[PDB]
Amino acid sequence: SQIPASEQETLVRPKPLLLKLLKSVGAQKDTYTMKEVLFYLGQYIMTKRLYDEKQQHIVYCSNDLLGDLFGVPSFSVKEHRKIYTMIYRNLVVVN
Numbered sequence: 143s144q145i146p147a148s149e150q151e152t153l154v155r156p157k158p159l160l161l162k163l164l165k166s167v168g169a170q171k172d173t174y175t176m177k178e179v180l181f182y183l184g185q186y187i188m189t190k191r192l193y194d195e196k197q198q199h200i201v202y203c204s205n206d207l208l209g210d211l212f213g214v215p216s217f218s219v220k221e222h223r224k225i226y227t228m229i230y231r232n233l234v235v236v237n
């Protein structure tokens with residue numbers, strides 16, 4: 143476990159661009175837990191096929207909404223701390 147369970151439950155308000163990404167996969171509301179935000183971003187990556195099927199551990203997000211939010215062309219899905227950092231820049235923490 144890389145991310146503490148307490149941190150996973152953190153209530154957050156996504157900024158407009160991340161909120162557009164979430165709404166595109168049916169996420170209706172304005173506040174979530176990070177766990178829920180991570181779930182929906184998971185659905186987004188799977189729905190848009192943002193990976194090589196032979197090498198599924200790397201997400202490629204260049205020229206996509208996700209890369210505009212994250213500020214990277216790609217990233218490893220193993221590095222959870224860096225993924226949390228990139229998500230934190232696109233939201234306001236509530237609690």
Ligand SMILES: CCOc1cccc(CN2[C@@H](C)[C@@H](N)[C@H](c3cccc(Cl)c3F)[C@]23C(=O)Nc2cc(Cl)ccc23)c1
Pocket residue numbers: 180181183184185187188193198201219220221222223225226
């Ligand atoms: C058939 C294709 O399958 C996939 C291909 C690539 C990615 C995924 C979705 N992944 C899985 C690999 C989870 N282990 C990974 C994950 C889960 C919890 C926390 C973090 Cl920090 C985390 F990274 C997660 C997820 O569930 N949400 C999410 C959001 C982002 Cl932005 C990046 C990665 C992920 C599925």
